[PDB]
Design an enzyme around this catalytic site. Structure first.
Site, short mmCIF file in Angstrom:
data_model
loop_
_atom_site.label_atom_id
_atom_site.label_comp_id
_atom_site.label_asym_id
_atom_site.label_seq_id
_atom_site.Cartn_x
_atom_site.Cartn_y
_atom_site.Cartn_z
N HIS A 251 -9.19 49.28 -38.02
CA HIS A 251 -9.93 49.03 -39.27
C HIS A 251 -11.42 48.78 -39.03
CE1 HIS A 251 -8.78 44.64 -38.86
NE2 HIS A 251 -10.07 44.51 -39.16
N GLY B 270 -14.07 38.16 -38.78
CA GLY B 270 -14.75 38.45 -37.52
C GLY B 270 -13.87 38.22 -36.30
N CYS C 32 -10.87 39.50 -35.84
CA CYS C 32 -10.04 40.67 -35.54
C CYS C 32 -10.39 41.26 -34.18
CB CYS C 32 -10.13 41.71 -36.66
SG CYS C 32 -9.72 41.07 -38.31
C1 LIG Z 1 -10.51 37.33 -43.42
C2 LIG Z 1 -9.70 37.23 -42.16
C3 LIG Z 1 -9.36 35.99 -41.63
C4 LIG Z 1 -8.55 35.93 -40.52
N1 LIG Z 1 -8.04 37.01 -39.91
C5 LIG Z 1 -8.37 38.20 -40.39
C6 LIG Z 1 -9.22 38.37 -41.49
N2 LIG Z 1 -9.64 39.65 -41.88
C7 LIG Z 1 -8.84 40.53 -42.51
O1 LIG Z 1 -7.67 40.30 -42.77
C8 LIG Z 1 -9.51 41.86 -42.89
C9 LIG Z 1 -10.54 41.74 -44.02
C10 LIG Z 1 -8.37 42.83 -43.21
C11 LIG Z 1 -8.01 43.12 -44.52
C12 LIG Z 1 -6.96 43.98 -44.79
C13 LIG Z 1 -6.23 44.53 -43.75
C14 LIG Z 1 -6.58 44.25 -42.43
C15 LIG Z 1 -5.78 44.74 -41.34
N3 LIG Z 1 -5.16 45.11 -40.45
C16 LIG Z 1 -7.66 43.42 -42.17
#
Ligand SMILES: Cc1ccncc1NC(=O)[C@H](C)c1cccc(C#N)c1
Ligand SMILES: Cc1ccncc1NC(=O)[C@H](C)c1cccc(C#N)c1
Lengths: 304, 304
Positions: free
Chosen positions: B41, B143, B145
């Site tokens: 992503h 951030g 990820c």
């Molecule tokens: C905001 C946040 C907080 C903690 N971990 C990850 C995140 N970040 C995410 O979950 C991002 C925005 C996202 C959105 C939809 C699908 C995927 C996938 N694979 C990733």
């Protein structure tokens, strides 16, 4: 999202760990620049520990009796000196992996990461708090002496603890990196009393703010309190008295959540008087005191 | 003495962390040998995440659009490929700090350390378990990820997890290092259900043995049970059914303490039916399930 008992990345400290042997005693040493730091009891036999005279014991030792092995290579010892309860071994080679560092003496209630080591090799890392009675509730076995506690501010490692001793109660005691014990302890095989411990009130409040930030809000109530009224309750439950200094460092959390510090004290008061009623806060069924306000700010903002 | 939620020393993994940027999206990458691994992503804008067609999105990208920065220096991307939900960026330089490593897919109920990172830099390390429903209860912000989960066997790092997503419930989801999600998740901004979770029974039993080893014995009773009787109770309390495979791996702990596994199951049965009665076990007021039998053996013996 989520809140964990997070330790600092241990990489910078792993590069400093060495094994120190003197006679038949082996423990861990910390190699920073051209000096290796370790507990002075490395020079004792088990029998010497009953009532050691460290000055006399060290007088029988020479530079060539301290064997320092960093991973696989042997360091050459060109000097030795005792500072309080630590031995400082001067080596002819500066550690190429020396991070930017400071030696700091932490206050009780502050937190730090421990890199538990055996025979100069790291086994694990965990976060803990220095108890108000100057003990730490670690996870240490024989051979772990010389393992260190630290904090990291961007690129600087502040070493605050060196492990020395396991008390008869199973709690741990040690020194700052100048060899001064935290608490009333002595490096001797004698039963030693650690003071009455208390709960770190400011830390529990910081952790209740972390819970609100992550969605655990059931404990928030419609009440408020005063410092005096809260301190009457804190004393009854063996909690540290809260001061305006504690209120001041909780300010960033109060600002983020909009919950006044004294309103959070009223939630803490009700949890102390009523218990959790079979519920949990941040995956815990008790009031957690190993996160300082600074730790909560750092974790909730993503500081690297 | 003492028992802690200990993470592996993160040094070997810190040396692999890089920052990957594509367009205006930045996340963490894992640089092993001449390949950088990151969540696919990284090629999406926020709007693309609603319903991404990753094949079409990746077709618009070239090697020069993926910026990989390892600490302070820039890596040259000479190839790119998508494997499941991970992107593999071939670089012209092998990471000089590549530890001995393997890519492994862990089973639910197994534990691992997470090195939480932001912009390619480590912020903290913590130990967690893969839930039976294939989620992890981490501590991750935007951030994070590309941050990875791992275990270490002496000198070999087994990477088992790469962080990808935060579910609407605040729990986390990710993939193995081949990009296959753990659980039924998809890398899309759509509400996704994680299964009913259960408590990892074998882990709670392992942790009750760790408590006995460290002196917490109040929960030991004069009773025993059978696998069938215990499993009737486990089902009523949403605990995983215990199997002979679970009994087999608890053997070293049963041998060390002299407490038969089924006798420990009877203590667990009484704790499930009666609660802790305001008492604690290893500093916890709940039954802890994030320590496997292997973790307890390793921690209680001092494996480095
Ligand atoms: C905001 C946040 C907080 C903690 N971990 C990850 C995140 N970040 C995410 O979950 C991002 C925005 C996202 C959105 C939809 C699908 C995927 C996938 N694979 C990733
Ligand atoms: C057995 C053990 C377990 C965990 N941590 C330390 C240890 N080791 C010790 O406490 C050693 C035997 C010791 C004895 C008496 C005084 C000092 C000091 N300073 C050190």
């Amino acid at each position: 999202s989520g809140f964990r008992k997070m330790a600092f990345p241990s990489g910078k400290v792993e590069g400093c760990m060495v094994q120190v042997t003197c006679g038949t005693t082996t423990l861990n040493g910390l190699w920073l620049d051209d000096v290796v730091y370790c507990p002075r009891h490395v020079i004792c036999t088990s029998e010497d520990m009953l009532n050691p005279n460290y000055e006399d014991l060290l007088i029988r030792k020479s530079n060539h009796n301290f064997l320092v092995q960093a991973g696989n290579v042997q360091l050459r010892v060109i000097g030795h000196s005792m500072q309080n309860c630590v031995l400082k071994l001067k080596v002819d080679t500066a550690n190429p992996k020396t991070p930017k560092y400071k030696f700091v003496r932490i206050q009780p209630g502050q937190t730090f990461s421990v890199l538990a080591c055996y025979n100069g090799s790291p086994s694990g890392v965990y976060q803990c708090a220095m108890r108000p009675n100057f003990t730490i509730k670690g996870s240490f076995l024989n051979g772990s002496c010389g393992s260190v506690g630290f904090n990291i501010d961007y690129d600087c490692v502040s070493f605050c603890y060196m492990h020395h001793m396991e008390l008869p109660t199973g709690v741990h005691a040690g020194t700052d990196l100048e060899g001064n014990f935290y608490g009333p302890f002595v490096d001797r095989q004698t039963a030693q009393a650690a003071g009455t411990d208390t709960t770190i009130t400011v830390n529990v409040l910081a952790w209740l703010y972390a819970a609100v930030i992550n969605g655990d809000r059931w404990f928030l109530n419609r009440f408020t309190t005063t410092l005096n009224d809260f301190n009457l309750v804190a004393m009854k439950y063996n909690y540290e008295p809260l001061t305006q200094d504690h209120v001041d460092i909780l300010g960033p959390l109060s600002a983020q959540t909009g919950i006044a510090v004294l309103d959070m004290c009223a939630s803490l008061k009700e949890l102390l008087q009523n218990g959790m009623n079979g519920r949990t806060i941040l995956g815990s069924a008790l009031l957690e005191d190993e996160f300082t306000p600074f730790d909560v700010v750092r974790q909730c903002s993503g500081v690297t």
